Design a protein around this ligand. Structure first.
Ligand SMILES: Nc1nc2c(ncn2[C@@H]2O[C@H](COP(=O)(O)OP(=O)(O)CP(=O)(O)O)[C@@H](O)[C@H]2O)c(=O)[nH]1
Ligand code: MET
Ligand SMILES: [Mg+2]
Ligand SMILES: [Mg+2]
Lengths: 470, 134, 48, 95
RNA sequence: AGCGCCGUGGCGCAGUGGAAGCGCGCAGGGCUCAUAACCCUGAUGUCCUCGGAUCGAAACCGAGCGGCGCUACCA
């Protein structure tokens, strides 16, 4: 007659629990799969791409179980602007007796080190293969910037294609191309609607999918039939995540950095101000390991215009108060995983859309803000995301001087003007400041049919820098 | 190579067939009962039970599309007004299209529930998260 | 001369009340369609 | 209390879906069709037909698209006929 | 989540503090050759729920419920 919660608590204490991270472990010997790292943080970033109104938060919620909220009155239903998140722990059974396809099992972040095998007749316990983070990306035509920013944050990709609807959906193609731009060659393909399809209709859809992916850079992407609502065939997807995606080369040698993508203010209404919390930068750390009590500065920071109209940038210095990742407060944060850096930064500085696409540097490094960025760019032959009613696809036109283009340097959302166009080179002047550290992968888009349309790729090779005022 | 794809497709089809071997044409014939300046819908309980919607919400939607007020007796709705079965059938079909029938999947198992204060109808056959309140 | 296409009964005017029996005919010579009345009591069932 | 009239070999019961202008009506015949009917003589301007009332309408052999109303049932012979079952009883019409 | 509100006789409003209110509804008769407009007359309510002050609360207020407009999804 034990309550369900008592049973879950007993299973949690028997399952290994949630360990507390050592306050000072030997770092050069810390691998992304170590227990101190794996049981409490997500080390590999996994994203979902697709056309609008097919269900990507549905698939992620079926996989892990952490909801993506989908907030803001009107945005509960139509579209979302912020990315969706969810922590998934991939567990595989140690018992060789239970068949491999159903060995894997993805659970929430709160799960124990070794939960029991829920397959009937299997007494063995699960082993944590890897912890992964899920970056849900709103797949709409209007919303371009966040898709490219997340794709920069991403490390592996999952493309969603519906069954009954038209085969060559252009948004899926655009997202796959954008993924190919930012050096992501690990994608697994999922057919979201199979239950409503016939045995031959599904085969025709698969043949169309193969026909579509022949001229793309990714060639041997595995294809998976999945059900988002029916909640089936997830263990196999966990298997494919384990097999086809290895760990990107990432060690602690690289200098510390950070890239804020979302911005969270911790101000619970109704509570007295004498008990508050700091301002949180939701950031992806692709390089650098951050600890408690580390001073860090937001380089593009305060953007101001002088009386003459000149652009001044005041870097936003900050002391790290906490590094919240996954579920528990953790001493060290593994680079390559979305983490909330809760610093003492002003809560209003983090209200909704303030720290979105902003590079941040730990003390001991001086990244440079640029006003002029000269880029090496390259284009495609036909636009993606446009449905032409039986005619040639819209062909990319060459760049014109003095034109506004959405240039996404990694995460930084900037609208650049062109000073000159060359055979392989171009020059861009930016209104919203952007900082450069090494090269940063950049995406280019222009305004032709009302909203932004991706055009090609580019990389900064030089630029004019502005020494920040301290 | 798509060899490791179609296999899971076959397993999914097998699971679909085993769990749901059955896989609406069950809308009651609308009996509009016109008493001169009065209208009676006596079968409203049968429609409400044959579409798995509570009669209270159906009557509210009726008095949202139709700008009148009526009384409930016993199961039956009486509205003192002259109206055709054409418009009753059309409004029933539209309600089924946006309330009784799920938009993502062709099913009737979905029911009206609540998730802070908005009305969130949720599905039972699959379990989707939709909203139809306005 | 013409060929019979369908057999339309045309409704009478005000002071009278009857269904005057007629027929749509497509004229062979040009193909224009004209409605022609058929005069007698039991003559319609003879049009064939 | 005048006696009712039954149907004969080409004259069938129907319901005014809605009455048309200029002396016409649209009658849903109890055969599955939304036919068009003319308000006949002997019945034009003495026995007023109201939208939603069971009637008798004569078919025409040589036009099945249009027919002509003949006799009207004042919802009493109509209910008695529904009780006897002269029409498909799914479409129940009553006050 | 908090705030600014609300809680109806069938619907809409209203005062909130002396305690069932009016129009729109509907039934009935009245004018009319007759219908509509217009006259007049009815049968129906926890003015949302628990309390506390009060000679008195539906009303002043609190400790709670439901429906809302924002703030805003507020690690
Ligand atoms: N029949 C069926 N419906 C599904 C499936 N997956 C999702 N849906 C439904 O499609 C609808 C869209 O879900 P949602 O997750 O909000 O789409 P979205 O990705 O957030 C919209 P955007 O692409 O712009 O980001 C939901 O109602 C969902 O339940 C599926 O596999 N099968
Ligand atoms: C990785 S947990 C989600 C991001 C941030 N730590 C909040 O909470
Ligand atoms: Mg989302
Ligand atoms: Mg006539």
């Amino acid at each position: 007659g034990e309550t369900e919660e008592e049973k879950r608590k007993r299973e949690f204490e028997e399952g290994g629990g949630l360990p507390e991270q050592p306050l000072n472990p030997d770092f050069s010997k810390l691998n992304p799969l170590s227990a101190e790292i794996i049981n409490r943080q997500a080390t590999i970033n996994i994203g979902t791409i697709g056309h609008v109104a097919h269900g990507k938060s549905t698939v992620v919620r079926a996989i892990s179980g952490v909801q993506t909220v989908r907030f803001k009155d009107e945005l509960e239903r139509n579209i979302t602007i912020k990315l969706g998140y969810a922590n998934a722990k991939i567990y595989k059974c140690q018992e060789p007796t239970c068949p491999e396809p159903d060995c894997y099992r993805s659970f929430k972040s709160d799960k124990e080190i070794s939960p029991k095998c829920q397959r009937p007749g299997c007494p063995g316990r699960y082993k944590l293969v890897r912890h992964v983070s899920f970056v849900d990306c709103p797949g709409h035509d209007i919303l371009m910037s966040t898709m490219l920013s997340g794709a920069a944050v991403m490390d592996a990709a999952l493309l969603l294609i519906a069954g009954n609807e038209s085969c060559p959906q252009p948004q899926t193609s655009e997202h796959l191309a954008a993924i190919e731009i930012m050096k992501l060659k690990h994608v697994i393909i999922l057919q979201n609607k199979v239950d409503l399809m016939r045995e031959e209709s599904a085969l025709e859809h698969q043949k169309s999918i193969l026909k579509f992916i022949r001229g793309t850079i990714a060639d041997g992407a595995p294809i998976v039939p999945i059900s988002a609502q029916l909640k089936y065939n997830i263990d196999a997807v966990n298997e494919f995540i384990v097999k086809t995606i290895p760990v990107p080369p990432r060690d602690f040698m690289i200098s510390p950095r950070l890239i804020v993508i979302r911005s969270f203010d911790v101000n619970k209404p109704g509570a007295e101000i004498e008990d508050l919390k700091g301002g949180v930068a939701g950031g992806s750390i692709l390089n650098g390991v951050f600890k408690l009590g580390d001073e860090i500065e937001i380089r593009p920071g305060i953007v101001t215009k002088d009386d003459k109209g000149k652009i001044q940038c005041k870097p936003i210095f900050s002391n790290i108060v906490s590094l919240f990742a996954e579920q528990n407060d953790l001493k060290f944060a593994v680079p390559g995983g979305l983490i909330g850096v809760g610093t003492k930064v002003d809560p209003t500085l983090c209200r909704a859309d303030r720290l979105v696409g902003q590079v941040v540097g730990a003390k001991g490094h001086l990244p440079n803000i640029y006003t002029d960025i000269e880029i090496n760019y390259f284009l495609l032959r036909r636009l993606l995301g446009v449905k032409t009613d039986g005619q040639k696809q819209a062909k990319v036109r060459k760049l014109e001087p003095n034109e506004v283009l959405m240039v996404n340097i990694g995460s930084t959302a900037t609208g650049a003007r062109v000073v000159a166009v060359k055979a392989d080179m171009a020059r861009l002047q930016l209104t919203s400041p952007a900082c450069t550290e090494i090269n940063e992968k950049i995406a280019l888009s222009r305004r032709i049919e009302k909203h932004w349309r991706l055009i090609g790729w580019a990389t900064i090779k030089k630029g004019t820098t502005l020494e920040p005022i301290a | 190579v798509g060899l490791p794809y179609s296999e899971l497709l076959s397993r999914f089809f097998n699971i679909l067939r085993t769990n749901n071997p059955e896989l609406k044409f069950r809308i009651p014939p609308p009996v509009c009962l016109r008493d001169g300046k009065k209208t009676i819908f006596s079968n409203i309980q049968d429609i409400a039970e044959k579409l798995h919607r509570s009669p209270e919400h159906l009557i509210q939607y009726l008095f949202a599309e139709l700008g009148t007020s009526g009384s409930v007796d016993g199961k039956r709705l009486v509205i003192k007004g002259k109206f055709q079965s054409k418009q009753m059938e059309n409004v029933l079909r539209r309600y089924i299209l946006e309330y009784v029938t799920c938009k993502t999947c062709k099913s009737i198992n979905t029911e009206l529930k609540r998730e802070n204060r908005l009305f969130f109808m949720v599905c039972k056959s699959c379990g989707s998260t939709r909203s139809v309140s306005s | 001369k013409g060929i019979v296409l369908e057999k339309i009964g045309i409704e009478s005017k005000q002071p009278n009340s009857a269904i005057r029996k007629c027929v749509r005919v497509q004229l062979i010579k040009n193909g224009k369609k004209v409605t022609a009345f058929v005069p007698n009591d039991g003559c319609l069932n003879f049009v064939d | 209390k005048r006696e009712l009239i039954y149907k004969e070999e080409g004259q069938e019961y129907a319901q005014i879906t809605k009455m048309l202008g200029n002396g016409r009506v649209e009658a849903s015949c109890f055969d599955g069709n939304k036919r068009m009917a003319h308000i006949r003589g002997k019945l034009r301007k003495k026995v007023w037909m109201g939208q939603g009332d069971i009637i008798l309408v004569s078919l025409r052999d040589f036009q099945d698209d249009q027919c002509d109303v003949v006799h009207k049932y004042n919802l009493d012979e109509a209910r008695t006929l529904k009780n006897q079952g002269e029409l498909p009883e799914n479409a129940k019409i009553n006050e």
